[PDB]
Symmetry: C3
Subunit: 112 residues, 3 copies
């Protein structure tokens, strides 16, 4: 089992939740976070000390799937979350040693 952790745009989150859910992927946990920004104008040049980075609101989705779903889940996120502009987010694959389902006490891939 791997923990998929993707940080995406807020405008693109409904598109990410809709891409995953349509493939039976439920169980995502969502956190409102702040990450690297920028934006447009007409003006002005966003400076800062130190070191000019404006922390802006983004969406963090965490989903724990089986080893064989990982690539399918990755593709679904990149396509739905993509815009082509800098700041579309990142996806991190984090090892998960074991999962425990509270209601049933189930463990392993069955628990998901």
């Amino acid at each position: 089992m791997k923990k998929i952790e993707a940080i995406v745009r807020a405008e693109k989150f409904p598109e990410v939740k809709a891409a995953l859910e349509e493939r039976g992927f439920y169980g995502m946990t969502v956190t409102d976070v702040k990450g690297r920004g920028q934006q447009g104008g007409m003006q002005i040049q966003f400076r800062g000390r130190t070191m000019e980075v404006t922390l802006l609101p983004k969406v963090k989705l965490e989903i724990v799937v089986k080893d064989d779903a990982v690539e399918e889940v990755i593709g679904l996120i990149v396509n739905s979350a993509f815009t082509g502009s800098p700041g579309d987010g990142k996806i991190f694959i984090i090892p998960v040693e074991d999962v425990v389902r509270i209601r049933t006490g189930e463990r392993g891939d069955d628990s998901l």
Copy 2:
């Protein structure tokens, strides 16, 4: 050392914080998150496109313990967080390679 990550009900969080603390487990970090919902009525059937999942407020607790506390911590969470109804949450065991205590610069199991 393992990172325990459990997503529970908000009504059950004081019961989880109270179960852990009574066993000397301090150090938990808590995040307000959203996860899979449902709820009751009398009515109505909660639909949605795509794919009918209502993201609802939950509690995320993260606790970094030594390898030998893991099972004790797991049991304490499942019992306090359990209701028997769908949506009691999940517990993920995530490997933690090393911990650093900022105030002391301590590392390893002593740092916790």
Copy 3:
């Protein structure tokens, strides 16, 4: 690649963001969390049942760097986040198996 996860003081966060950024470290994701408190007075002794722990607002920063930056990143956080008083926070080193940059589809250390 490792995921650095540090839970620090809110007063010290601008000092942490400024220490990292000055070394080209961008990409941090920030979450408002709650952790172990205490505080001063003149009074009063903060009790509680169970077991007297007051969950207080803190800052969580997550940064995914290459294996060789890990120690440099660790030092920068401890120094900027340190005060000497109990509650300066902790830094956890979590293995990250793979990173995916959404805008480019890049993977590995290049993606960061």
